Design a protein around this ligand. Structure first.
Ligand SMILES: CC(C)CN(C[C@@H](O)[C@H](Cc1cc(F)cc(F)c1)NC(=O)O[C@H]1CO[C@H]2OCC[C@H]21)S(=O)(=O)c1ccc2c(c1)CC[C@H]2O
Lengths: 99, 99
């Protein structure tokens, strides 16, 4: 699906049996999701942004179905204001910018 | 030009006669640039992101040529870690997400 940018590029995702809305973010290198109980082992990590840094839990090899397209990659979980799908997963579904 | 997301979608911009590199960010509503000397009147503002908020100076009706595409819109200037082109300007140059 071609998505215009007149509105926030929000998509429906399926992760860990839960349905959520996430922002397709080309400015994010990786994926970070609001707090949730994702299964598996994880190791603490720190991510930075415009306002500073937040503490996140790094889960690897996590399945996510973004708008019906499946991808497996690292998923960070922490106090992010919004769910954002980063380039680590956008590349798997074949997402591209076009102008 | 079609841009894949295996690398950061960085583009060359020209603003205020200055050459810089900026990130095409579909997850950003507006444009924020690292500290620079932009001509004109400005109004204080606050923007929030991952980690908190920063104080920026709001310049309106600023010309930017993104990869050869010209646009005029609000440009924020403050302590952002990276230059980010937001949807306010991505829509003017006809940027669309595709997967
Ligand atoms: C989260 C989204 C919804 C909103 N953000 C856009 C996001 O793309 C951002 C871009 C960035 C920021 C940065 F500090 C350094 C960078 F290298 C890149 N990346 C991000 O936080 O991603 C994280 C996960 O991956 C990691 O890699 C990159 C950083 C880490 S924002 O910046 O909070 C924001 C909010 C309000 C406004 C604007 C911007 C513009 C004016 C106003 O409208």
């Amino acid at each position: 699906p071609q998505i215009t940018l007149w509105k926030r590029p929000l998509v429906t995702i399926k992760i860990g049996g839960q349905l959520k809305e996430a922002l397709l973010d080309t400015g994010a290198d990786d994926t970070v999701l609001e707090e949730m109980n994702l299964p598996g082992r994880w190791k603490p990590k720190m991510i930075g942004g415009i306002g500073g840094f937040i503490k996140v839990r790094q889960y690897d090899q996590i399945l996510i179905e973004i708008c019906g397209h499946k991808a497996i990659g690292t998923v960070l979980v922490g106090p992010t204001p919004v769910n954002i799908i980063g380039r680590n997963l956008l590349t798997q579904i074949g997402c591209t910018l076009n102008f």
